Amino acid sequence: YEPPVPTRVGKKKKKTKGPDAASKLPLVTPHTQCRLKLLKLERIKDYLLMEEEFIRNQEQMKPLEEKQEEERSKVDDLRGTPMSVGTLEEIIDDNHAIVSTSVGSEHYVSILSFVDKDLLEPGCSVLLNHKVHAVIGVLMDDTDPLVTVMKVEKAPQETYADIGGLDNQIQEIKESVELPLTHPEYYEEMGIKPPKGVILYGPPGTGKTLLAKAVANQTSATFLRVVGSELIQKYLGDGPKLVRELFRVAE
Amino acid sequence: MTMSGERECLKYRLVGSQEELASWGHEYVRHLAGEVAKEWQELDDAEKVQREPLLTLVKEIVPYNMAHNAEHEACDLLMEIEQVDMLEKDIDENAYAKVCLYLTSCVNYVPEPENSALLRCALGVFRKFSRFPEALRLALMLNDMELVEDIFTSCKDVVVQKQMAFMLGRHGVFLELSEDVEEYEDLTEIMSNVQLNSNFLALARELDIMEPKVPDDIYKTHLENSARMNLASSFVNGFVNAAFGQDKLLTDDGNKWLYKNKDHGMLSAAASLGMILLWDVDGGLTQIDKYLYSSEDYIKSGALLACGIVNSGVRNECDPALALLSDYVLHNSNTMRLGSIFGLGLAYAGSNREDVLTLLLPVMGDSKSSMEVAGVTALACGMIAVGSCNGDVTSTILQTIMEKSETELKDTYARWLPLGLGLNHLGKGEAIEAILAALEVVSEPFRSFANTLVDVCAYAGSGNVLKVQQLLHICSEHFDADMGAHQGVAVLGIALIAMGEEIGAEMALRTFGHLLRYGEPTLRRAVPLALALISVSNPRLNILDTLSKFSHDADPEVSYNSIFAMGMVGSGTNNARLAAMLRQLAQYHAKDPNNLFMVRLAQGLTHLGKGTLTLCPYHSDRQLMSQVAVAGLLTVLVSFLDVRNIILGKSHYVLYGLVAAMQPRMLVTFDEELRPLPVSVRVGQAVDVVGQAGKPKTITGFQTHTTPVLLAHGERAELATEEFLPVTPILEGFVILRKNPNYDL
Amino acid sequence: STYSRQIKQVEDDIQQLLKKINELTGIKESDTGLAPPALWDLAADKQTLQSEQPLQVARCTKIINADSEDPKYIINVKQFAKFVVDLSDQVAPTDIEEGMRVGVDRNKYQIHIPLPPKIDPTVTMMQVEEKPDVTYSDVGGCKEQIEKLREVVETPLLHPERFVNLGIEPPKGVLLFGPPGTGKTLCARAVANRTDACFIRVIGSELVQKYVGEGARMVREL
Amino acid sequence: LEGRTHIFKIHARSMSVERDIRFELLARLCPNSTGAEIRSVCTEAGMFAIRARRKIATEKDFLEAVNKVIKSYAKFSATPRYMTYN
Amino acid sequence: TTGIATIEVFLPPRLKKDRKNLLETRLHITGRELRSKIAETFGLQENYIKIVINKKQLQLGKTLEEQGVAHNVKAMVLELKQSEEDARKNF
Numbered sequence A: 001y002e003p004p005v006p007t008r009v010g011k012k013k014k015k016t017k018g019p020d021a022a023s024k025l026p027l028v029t030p031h032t033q034c035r036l037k038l039l040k041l042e043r044i045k046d047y048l049l050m051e052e053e054f055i056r057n058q059e060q061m062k063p064l065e066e067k068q069e070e071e072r073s074k075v076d077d078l079r080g081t082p083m084s085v086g087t088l089e090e091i092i093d094d095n096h097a098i099v100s101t102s103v104g105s106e107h108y109v110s111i112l113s114f115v116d117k118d119l120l121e122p123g124c125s126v127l128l129n130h131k132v133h134a135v136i137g138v139l140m141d142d143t144d145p146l147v148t149v150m151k152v153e154k155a156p157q158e159t160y161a162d163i164g165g166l167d168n169q170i171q172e173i174k175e176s177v178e179l180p181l182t183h184p185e186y187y188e189e190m191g192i193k194p195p196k197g198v199i200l201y202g203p204p205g206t207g208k209t210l211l212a213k214a215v216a217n218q219t220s221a222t223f224l225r226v227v228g229s230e231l232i233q234k235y236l237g238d239g240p241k242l243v244r245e246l247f248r249v250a251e
Numbered sequence B: 001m002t003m004s005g006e007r008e009c010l011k012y013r014l015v016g017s018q019e020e021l022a023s024w025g026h027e028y029v030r031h032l033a034g035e036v037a038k039e040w041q042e043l044d045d046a047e048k049v050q051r052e053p054l055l056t057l058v059k060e061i062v063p064y065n066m067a068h069n070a071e072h073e074a075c076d077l078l079m080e081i082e083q084v085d086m087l088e089k090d091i092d093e094n095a096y097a098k099v100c101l102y103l104t105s106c107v108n109y110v111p112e113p114e115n116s117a118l119l120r121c122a123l124g125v126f127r128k129f130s131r132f133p134e135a136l137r138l139a140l141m142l143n144d145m146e147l148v149e150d151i152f153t154s155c156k157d158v159v160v161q162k163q164m165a166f167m168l169g170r171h172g173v174f175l176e177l178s179e180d181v182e183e184y185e186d187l188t189e190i191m192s193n194v195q196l197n198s199n200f201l202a203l204a205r206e207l208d209i210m211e212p213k214v215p216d217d218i219y220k221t222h223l224e225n226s227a228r229m230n231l232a233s234s235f236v237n238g239f240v241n242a243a244f245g246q247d248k249l250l251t252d253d254g255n256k257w258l259y260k261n262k263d264h265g266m267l268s269a270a271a272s273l274g275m276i277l278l279w280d281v282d283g284g285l286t287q288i289d290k291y292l293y294s295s296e297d298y299i300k301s302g303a304l305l306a307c308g309i310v311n312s313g314v315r316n317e318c319d320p321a322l323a324l325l326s327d328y329v330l331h332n333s334n335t336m337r338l339g340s341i342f343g344l345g346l347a348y349a350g351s352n353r354e355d356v357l358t359l360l361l362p363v364m365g366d367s368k369s370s371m372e373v374a375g376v377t378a379l380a381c382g383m384i385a386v387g388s389c390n391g392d393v394t395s396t397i398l399q400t401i402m403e404k405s406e407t408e409l410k411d412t413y414a415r416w417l418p419l420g421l422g423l424n425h426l427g428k429g430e431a432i433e434a435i436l437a438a439l440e441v442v443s444e445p446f447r448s449f450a451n452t453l454v455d456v457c458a459y460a461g462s463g464n465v466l467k468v469q470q471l472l473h474i475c476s477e478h479f480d481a482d483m484g485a486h487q488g489v490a491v492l493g494i495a496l497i498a499m500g501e502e503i504g505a506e507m508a509l510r511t512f513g514h515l516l517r518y519g520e521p522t523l524r525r526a527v528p529l530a531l532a533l534i535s536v537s538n539p540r541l542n543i544l545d546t547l548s549k550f551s552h553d554a555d556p557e558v559s560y561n562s563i564f565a566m567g568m569v570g571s572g573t574n575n576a577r578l579a580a581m582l583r584q585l586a587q588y589h590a591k592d593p594n595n596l597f598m599v600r601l602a603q604g605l606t607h608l609g610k611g612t613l614t615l616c617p618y619h620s621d622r623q624l625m626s627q628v629a630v631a632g633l634l635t636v637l638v639s640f641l642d643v644r645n646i647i648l649g650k651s652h653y654v655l656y657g658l659v660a661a662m663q664p665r666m667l668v669t670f671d672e673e674l675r676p677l678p679v680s681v682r683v684g685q686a687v688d689v690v691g692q693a694g695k696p697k698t699i700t701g702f703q704t705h706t707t708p709v710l711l712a713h714g715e716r717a718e719l720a721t722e723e724f725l726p727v728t729p730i731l732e733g734f735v736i737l738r739k740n741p742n743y744d745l
Numbered sequence C: 001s002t003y004s005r006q007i008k009q010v011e012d013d014i015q016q017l018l019k020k021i022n023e024l025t026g027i028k029e030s031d032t033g034l035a036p037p038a039l040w041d042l043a044a045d046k047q048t049l050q051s052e053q054p055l056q057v058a059r060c061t062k063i064i065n066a067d068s069e070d071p072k073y074i075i076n077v078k079q080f081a082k083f084v085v086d087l088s089d090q091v092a093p094t095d096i097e098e099g100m101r102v103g104v105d106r107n108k109y110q111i112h113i114p115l116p117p118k119i120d121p122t123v124t125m126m127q128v129e130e131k132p133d134v135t136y137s138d139v140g141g142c143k144e145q146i147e148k149l150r151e152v153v154e155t156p157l158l159h160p161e162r163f164v165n166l167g168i169e170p171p172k173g174v175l176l177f178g179p180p181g182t183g184k185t186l187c188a189r190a191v192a193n194r195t196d197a198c199f200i201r202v203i204g205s206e207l208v209q210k211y212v213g214e215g216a217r218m219v220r221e222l
Numbered sequence D: 001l002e003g004r005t006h007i008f009k010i011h012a013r014s015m016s017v018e019r020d021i022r023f024e025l026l027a028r029l030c031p032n033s034t035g036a037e038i039r040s041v042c043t044e045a046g047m048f049a050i051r052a053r054r055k056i057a058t059e060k061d062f063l064e065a066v067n068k069v070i071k072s073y074a075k076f077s078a079t080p081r082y083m084t085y086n
Numbered sequence E: 001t002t003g004i005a006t007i008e009v010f011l012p013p014r015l016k017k018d019r020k021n022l023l024e025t026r027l028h029i030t031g032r033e034l035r036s037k038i039a040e041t042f043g044l045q046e047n048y049i050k051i052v053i054n055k056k057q058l059q060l061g062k063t064l065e066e067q068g069v070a071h072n073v074k075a076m077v078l079e080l081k082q083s084e085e086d087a088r089k090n091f
């Protein structure tokens, strides 16, 4: 006997998350309403028109068992009901993995073909068949209650106009958290990466949080707020674990 | 303009006051300009008397459009009315680049006869404004042999002219200059690529990669937790240090390694010595002679093809390669013959030289020539006369095709005869209806394959969707193999047609997935090859992930073809991620020698030339189509449709066809005296500059390196400073730099 | 603006064509982790669900009478139970050793496949899968530092032949120390980019764990 | 000094610097400075140029960047406390 | 003219000489005599060279006119490793 060898490089999932999937149409330039854009727009339409005719012809002569709604129905039959939720412990092979159910019992089950294999990572929540425990799906993890705490869902109502006298301070903070996103070309044409970090320091009440609130009001990026005292945890390693998770949500 | 305005907005304009048009507003003329094109199509031939005031407006609308930077709308006007000619008279110095850059981008989608016509007007503008280097680029795209001479000799600045020979030599088109032309010698020397070896060797000396590489350093078996193995490592050896001239495995006591191979393994192992001396015509010939006297049948014939590989891509004045191999094209042993024609095909690919062709033509008609020899002669003659529509080769290739038997055409080596005919008409277009009529008389199913293949090579790099429409219909009807052999060519056809512009190529990737889903085995075995052709030396993740999932497929050919496609997609890129995948695939396919041979073949290709070479058929900002490179690629991938019998069989020397497609991904900036001139340049991903006015950046995510740097696919280069004015805007290959008079004022 | 009316007409058709294509091909769900249908081998999956039985993960504890022709294996099936079982006939007796995880069926619990040792998912995530974008050319003023770093951590793996011939055992450890910002992690990022062997990044604060002996466990599994 | 000039060359490689940026002089203006400070000096030097709507970083911009990073930010410098540890 | 032909030869880049060098000789002489003098005229060793003229290898026995050479013909010099007899005798 010889150990199975994976064809996938590594054990981690694909970095890309939340893409356009197969709707990634080519980026047509220029955006101006001209004939070249019209020619490119027709060009994309032409291939789709070919695509529609080609796919229809195959499915027309495809067997009644092999149909888009029939195969989807067969997938549900293969998955079954209920759909147990487990934990991915190890990816032994491309189509084999070690999973553990909620009772703590591990199983050496087979990852079925319809499973999104690039969402598979150790520790992820996997969906298993009730009977044969085979991997039949991956549970899109719900937003952690820890995520909701950091995220400021609604931007604060404090603007830069509500700040008086911190003209230089606004200008310095804008250039590291606002300008790099609004006008990233300024940094690229200069060849400089934007100032990495920023710290606001001074006497109490001087407007440190207020400028951050103004930053959160006029930001297109996700804003995560954590007070430093919230990093003191009641258990060993949890504090380091929390700092690790905070920047994981940021990623 | 408030309502529909059908034959009204122009009418009161036409009949009313004839004052200056812009006095009524920019938005008014824009609607007015949109009208004059709409009514132009409606007007028939009998309505020629109705365009007298219609013409007057466009002589004023175009000058109005260029005044307010609304230049791209000006091209949109006279392209619709098919009157692009009058643009050049009103082109100013402040917008000549913007007008050219726009309509040249439309040449990838507008069909004939507006295809050439739009280029001709752009050609006229560049000729008018004395922008010779970009005028020559347009001429080659139109494959106007006559116009190339006129563009070349019109210029008087000799410094400007040597730059063209670099561009002309890179495209592989030869010009026979007159001795009366000043600086005749170096002009030929530059375009004949005789100095390419020294320039290539001097480059890598600056990159300090002269150290030879063993296949073990590529394999990295020490991190891993036979005749095929030895023959596989021969390719991996030659590919890694191709055109480098030094090898720790063949030059150093090559007899033990060369004889470690067996049967046809020694054929490719011996020929691999000519690939490490690629472009080294003088020095490379000095090394193959030791194996040229070998008593074994394969070694000499392998050394025969090695000379052709050595002289491939280099055109010297006085011809060695024909001499060493002419005496063996009728040699009684087919293997001795076999190493000859494929040697001549690579040695003179894209030459259209009647000397080699007439010497090679009777070989295919010989009684002693087997079908294996018959195929390579069509392949080779196709490379010499690629895209030339040579009348002589068409007659004999057709003659051979119908003279063969019904059972003879069943052999997969017979598939090569159509490619030779297809190669001759590479990119020619509709010049095949006479040829396609001749293919009617030949028997089935070979006729369907031959009809599909030659039609595909006709429209190579054209993007003609109507032709791709036919190709998908051929793929539509499935057959429950023998009758569906032609289906693989149609899939390779879609890539060969859509490889023109980016929009079509990416739009073809999704259609490749559907053939990869609804397809049948013989239809699904070729779509990995289409991915390789459509994106060779372009290791984009979408194709690689698509190929990665399908490397371990149930169908052996799909597994074999997909892995090879990964290597060709990353050919010469030295991609760290791809090498990791190929190393992992080696572990998975350890117990499958056939799959592992494909994995080993891919590992050699991704480290081709130590990352200093590319197989992409496109250069000049991915706008110029190289006839020789497509011939080299097409030879390999069309041979991969029968990967069981040809590549994995006794005929793996066909993998040396991509030698014709080997070029260095080069940026070497030369002084006016052709000496090296290292300066700071900015290398980064190209950005489309069509549309937006002003000065938009054409590179993003760029970095600053010295000049002798290897440019990856899709990476443009701009000079960081203004110390030197490039002769040509396109900063690829060898570039001549001139001191800027305004600089250091 | 003259093409504005026609551009939206073809843009909407493309969107309508795109949605129509998704109707036949199928681009949906993605919340139960369903792969695109291009990778769906339903015929094979049905065969796997019958031909390939599921195997429960168990650890061998003792082999009884290994010398004889009736070797009996005591297995610990996680939290389920402990069973004295015999080996399956499609695996070799020499392939199962005491203390090694095995895969057992649900009916007679006979060992069907040996399994890799259990590793903490956190420890598994410690190995670098995407190399950094930093090379040694991005480290300046550390010429002597890098050569010492490379000849211990890079040279032995790249060219091991130069050390075995001379009977040399190269050092197996390097400590990089200096004030913050001096390039300690920068050089290690260059090492991971250039290295071909497995690279595992372990931050010391990651080894601090809530429970007693857990931090030492992760070092053992690492 | 040689190492600091080398780090300056590394981080100012992709910058849009002027003709005669005296990188040896800039390396001399920060005697005991980590490579992290040198990178920030390069970033702030181009950051002053962005401030002035200028596409090329002059030598004065680097001189101001050295003052802001090496001199003004010397209160928070971790170097003096950590050389005793190393 | 007067029984002497203009033979332009090519030299390898290792011998850093003028690659556009001119060789003058009779036509009644043979290939064996030719190979000797090309070595002398540009400082080379005759035992380790092949000559090719009119895109066909210089057959040493056959005389020039019966070889097929003509006026303003172009030639080259190929450096050799191991002699033609030595290479055959090697294995």
Ligand SMILES: Nc1ncnc2c1ncn2[C@@H]1O[C@H](COP(=O)(O)OP(=O)(O)OP(=O)(O)O)[C@@H](O)[C@H]1O
Pocket: A162, A163, A164, A165, A166, A203, A204, A205, A206, A207, A208, A209, A210, A211
């Ligand atoms: N410069 C200012 N302009 C306008 N309002 C200000 C300014 N400085 C402080 N304030 C007001 O003071 C309030 C409280 O100050 P803030 O929360 O910003 O303090 P801080 O600077 O973060 O200090 P700390 O957290 O140390 O107490 C703000 O909500 C804001 O309305």
Ligand SMILES: Nc1ncnc2c1ncn2[C@@H]1O[C@H](COP(=O)(O)OP(=O)(O)OP(=O)(O)O)[C@@H](O)[C@H]1O
Pocket: C138, C139, C140, C141, C142, C178, C179, C180, C181, C182, C183, C184, C185, C186, C187, D007, D010, D034, D035, D036, D037, D039
């Ligand atoms: N020798 C160097 N050459 C070039 N850049 C350097 C050099 N040393 C540091 N840098 C730059 O400074 C940054 C400092 O980060 P780095 O990871 O090197 O710090 P460190 O020495 O590990 O610090 P700490 O002890 O706080 O962890 C690097 O990311 C790099 O951009």
Ligand SMILES: [Mg+2]
Pocket: A208, A209
């Ligand atoms: Mg506060």
Ligand SMILES: [Mg+2]
Pocket: C184, C185
């Ligand atoms: Mg660190």
